[PDB]
């Protein structure tokens, strides 16, 4: 009976017995091997690692239920599981004593805690489920012979993504009969997809069922709106009401007939338009559209509906003018990636290296961030999902236990790439750098994913590793193809083969030309044009003027960087003097031209 | 132009040339000339004139003084 141990913790068994809880599915691993882990006489005591909100707590829920259709092994069999809270335990330790005493020498209840009683686990008189996670089970569970060997280091697999199409399937029925609303095939997967996708901070399996709650429940809201219907008649007997309610406290019962009669045909009236409204809505059934999903999913991270539409089937076909849009001049670099990316997505690459691995040389401001940021916002469809990582400042010993994250006693990279796996990870003045760095790097691309002290495996998968490096910059300012040929000798040579063998493509940038500069200032003038989009302001500037401004701070060791500047405190800076002015000008149209001495900025309208 | 480029070098030396792209302008100041100091005494004494405004009490330096 064990009654101690009930005066001291909680037992879930009791409450999953009843079967009115949820169908915990998706486990069939998990809980095998917890059974297989509990039934054996060495490490009876299995303690569940996992990454927290992940499934670590759910796997041990469809254990409990499990119970009462004897699916667990013989020697599991009518065995009562009681899950207690860490937070619950002298007098803190007396709860935790009895409730070992009672079940050391009964062996019918096996405890839990949300890893005195050590002596209960080494023996294996009493069961001990852990539910921490990976660094607590190392720092603890490990820190002694005794406890680790009597410890099962179990690890509480996730579902998979078949896993929870399944769970949705037959779960499906459940929430028609709640919200009243039919769900399609099509939704299921188009949820699944997206879930998987978007949500990276929930993971599987608690970021799918929630997903199309909400888009039921907005649909039943939408569906239930009256279009001037009912209202104008609910008003009407509102009105009646209150108008025969006053005659009647007035002693004036000359008009309450005509009223109460006047009350009772609206009452029928209301009564037949709804009789006739409901009638119609339930001869259709309102089907979850795959929209309804992308709607809601738009909303929490800001991604367009049009990415969102998007099947990967249009992408990379887009792929090239997308580049071209954002970034103008040396082609031969912008093509040149396009055409390794979309045969790495067939499968000719392993899906566990980084599909994106291209080297960039020359001198910064060029054009080089302006390519790296817009690949992001093509590729995924972000624009600020950039984790840019230098290297200027790592230059000492401990340089490498920075990125690699906190080690167990102290007080980077990868905290940040766990929340967003899906990002591009830049490494500028890679050629500076010190030599242990190196060796986390060579793993990323050769293997394919990291384990940080913690014991916390992240993913590379769908993540694009491009290093900046300053080599072959200055040979290149004392056929691209020719160029690159004549720097991989170069770059080889600095650095070492084993590490370039990872390598797909190289890049090196050339030297913009006068005629190139003069697009890069129209799309920079649009580009400011757009941002003034609220006011009303047209924007227009001359050939005339491009051209002389465009040599005026040309830097060739820079490159496109002091344009910015200059087209910033030329054009700028004589136009907001006139807005400043009492809004001289208002919804006009602004024409900037250059006769050759000075700027005249033509004052005219739209 | 010049004096700002040439401190713009050294500046990003030092530190990190991301952190210095988001700077709209890098404001170099100058020496102190002669001339110049004469209107800061002049500014000085106004000041001080101003602060005795409860008093009433008007302050005037001859441009001999300033000088010296």
Redo the contacts between chains.
Sequence with gaps: NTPTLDSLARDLTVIAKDGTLDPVIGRDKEITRVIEVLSRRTKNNPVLIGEPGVGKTAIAEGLAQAIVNNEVPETLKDKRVMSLDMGTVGEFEERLKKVMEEIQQAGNVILFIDLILKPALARGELQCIGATTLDEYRKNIEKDAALERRFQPVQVDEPSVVDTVAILKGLRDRYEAHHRINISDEAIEAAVKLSNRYVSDRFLPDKAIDLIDEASSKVRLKSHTTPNNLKEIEQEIEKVKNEKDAAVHAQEFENAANLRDKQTKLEKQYEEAKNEWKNAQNGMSTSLSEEDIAEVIAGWTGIPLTKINETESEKLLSLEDTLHERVIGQKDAVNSISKAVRRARAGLKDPKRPIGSFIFLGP?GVGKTELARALAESMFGDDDAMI?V?M??FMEKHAVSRLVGAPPGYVQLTEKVRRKPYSVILF?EIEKAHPDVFNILLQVLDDGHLTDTKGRTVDFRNTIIIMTSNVGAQELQDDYETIRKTMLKELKNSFRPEFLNRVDDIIVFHKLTKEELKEIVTMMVNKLTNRLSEQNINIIVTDKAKDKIAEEGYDPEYGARPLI?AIQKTIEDNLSELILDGNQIEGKKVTVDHDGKEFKYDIAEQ
């Design positions: 910064t840019r230098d200027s400042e500028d500047r």
